[PDB]
């Protein structure tokens, strides 16, 4: 019903479709950084054996002492080539995904009226999938994405990864969250995230609880050996446990060994995920629906009489009537009159005419409803002479 032009579609694109292009770019950046790391590491590995052969050559060596080094450098070059090929491939796959998404976004400008419709349907489906994933319905979101054919244009992998990490964290597990915080190490470090240290402390506590002291000491020496600031204080507090059994009732240990630190870990992970990918307080679907319901809402939709309600107004329906109650009303500084007999528009070409009763009706409707020489009011059911109608001017 709503008519839209190319400029309005461009404005909608400028407002809405930020995440669909932001997320694959972040994946591309992360994969590129990992690629550079791998290539540099293998470069160092091959350079080491090259330098070893270079020193060896000076002291007049034997053929059996250089053939092995040649074979070794051959193997190092081969593994370097394989690891570079695989990583550059991953880079290209991410870039291709970005290109496909931007092509689909650019597709909206089709002149055919039979393609903009399916594009609008796909846009609505994408927004609904994003909203459903944010709410917490995963199977429904996957089913909708599969049935609508937008399984490539939506980003469900990050939501599923976060769900799996949180579910594992709720099962008293401490390895998945660690993998996630080591995978996204640079961005987590840049935003000053202290989740890895908390997970290490939790591991230390877990080894304390089952009465395994030497392993806990080894773990603390491996990890807790470079603490500073509040980290050092927390490390000292944790190391204080080494003289107590896992059944104490004293404030700095019993209040900490309780199964409530898992809730804090879950909250911290949720906050870190919220900061890592810029997720707003509200989804795009909710904001768009609120704007639409505000723009359609009119005072006649909340009349207790029930005569003003229409069978086509979206906010006149029960669910949308209850849903859009607090929303701001629509601004209207100009008249927009619709005839009651026919539902047409009473513009200049269809002048409004008042019957001496006091009710106005369209000219064309009056001429299509007149019988013989008589006009019948369809509300008061009172017959009126046709010539008694008076034209009405709207300033």
């Amino acid at each position: 019903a709503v008519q839209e032009s190319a400029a309005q579609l461009s404005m909608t694109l400028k407002v809405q479709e930020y995440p669909t292009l932001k997320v694959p770019y972040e994946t591309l950046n992360k994969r590129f950084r990992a690629a550079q790391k791998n290539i540099d590491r293998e470069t160092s590995h091959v350079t080491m054996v090259v330098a070893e052969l270079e020193k060896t050559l000076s002291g007049c060596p034997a053929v059996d002492s250089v053939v092995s080094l040649l074979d070794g450098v051959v193997e190092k070059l081969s593994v370097l080539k394989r690891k570079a090929v695989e990583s550059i491939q991953a880079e290209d796959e991410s870039a291709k995904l970005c290109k496909r998404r931007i092509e689909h976004l650019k597709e909206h400008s089709s002149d055919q009226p039979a393609a903009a419709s399916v594009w609008k349907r796909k846009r609505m489906d994408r927004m609904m999938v994003e909203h459903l994933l944010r709410c917490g319905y995963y199977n429904t979101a996957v089913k909708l994405a599969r049935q609508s054919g937008i399984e490539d244009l939506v980003n469900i992998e990050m939501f599923l990864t976060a769900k799996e990490v949180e579910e594992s964290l709720e099962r008293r597990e401490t390895a998945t969250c660690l993998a996630w915080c080591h995978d996204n190490k640079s961005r987590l470090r840049k935003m000053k995230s202290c989740l890895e240290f908390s997970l290490r402390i939790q591991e230390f506590i877990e080894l304390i609880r089952q009465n395994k002291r030497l392993d806990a000491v080894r773990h603390a020496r491996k990890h807790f050996s470079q603490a500073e600031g509040s980290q050092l204080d927390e490390v000292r507090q944790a190391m204080g446990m080494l003289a107590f059994p896992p059944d104490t009732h004293i404030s700095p240990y019993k209040d900490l060994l309780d199964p409530a630190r898992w809730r804090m870990l879950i909250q911290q992970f949720r906050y870190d995920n919220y900061r890592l990918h810029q997720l707003g307080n509200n989804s795009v679907f909710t904001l768009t629906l609120q704007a639409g319901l505000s723009a359609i809402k009119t005072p006649q939709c909340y009349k207790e009489d029930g005569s003003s309600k229409s069978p086509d107004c979206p906010v006149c329906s029960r669910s949308l009537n209850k849903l859009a109650q607090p929303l701001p009303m629509a601004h209207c500084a100009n008249s927009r009159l619709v005839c009651k007999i026919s539902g047409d528009v009473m513009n200049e070409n269809n002048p409004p005419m008042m019957l001496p009763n006091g009710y106005v009706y369209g000219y064309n409707s009056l001429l299509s409803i007149r019988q013989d020489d008589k006009v019948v009011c369809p509300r008061t059911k009172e017959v009126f002479h046709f010539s008694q109608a008076e034209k009405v001017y709207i300033m």
Partner: protein, 156 residues
């Protein structure tokens, strides 16, 4: 009452007009550009609008801060002297109507019969070239890739 002032100011802002509020919604200033074709073309003025408490029905006060050489505009204060603003004001007009069709029409077609600036009318009724010259003077004199993000080292 107040809602009408709200609506008028919002409509003025939406129509791409430079509006600056000084001491509330009662009084503000608007940037007014000279009409094309008229000798006042290419001039920029700042005009103050004040709205009385019975605004929709009582007339507002409009005055030029800068100096305009017009047969009926005060050279010192800046009183507009328009009929549709002083005594023939209805409740249906708004600020957008003024800034879109009243000031340009007054600037294009003056009334040198019962004017407010005697010198301007005297110069306009006899020496059109001198009039154009003085207006040009007043208009010229009074109304005129970054550094790349950081990358870390590998680790065995």
């Amino acid at each position: 009452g107040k809602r009408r002032m709200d609506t008028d100011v919002v409509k003025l802002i939406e129509s791409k007009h430079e509006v600056t509020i000084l001491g509330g919604l009662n009084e503000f200033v608007v940037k007014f550009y000279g009409p094309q074709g008229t000798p006042y073309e290419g001039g920029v003025w700042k005009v103050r609008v004040d709205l009385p408490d019975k605004y929709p029905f009582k007339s507002p006060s409009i005055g030029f801060m800068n100096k305009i050489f017009h047969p009926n505009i005060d050279e010192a204060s800046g009183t507009v002297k328009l009929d549709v603003i002083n005594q023939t004001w209805t409740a249906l007009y708004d600020l957008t109507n003024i800034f879109e069709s009243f000031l340009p029409q007054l600037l294009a077609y003056p009334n040198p019969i019962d004017p407010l600036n005697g010198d301007a009318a005297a110069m306009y009724l006899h020496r059109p070239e001198e009039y154009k010259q003085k207006i040009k003077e007043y208009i010229q004199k009074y109304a005129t890739s970054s550094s790349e993000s950081s990358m870390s080292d590998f680790s065995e």
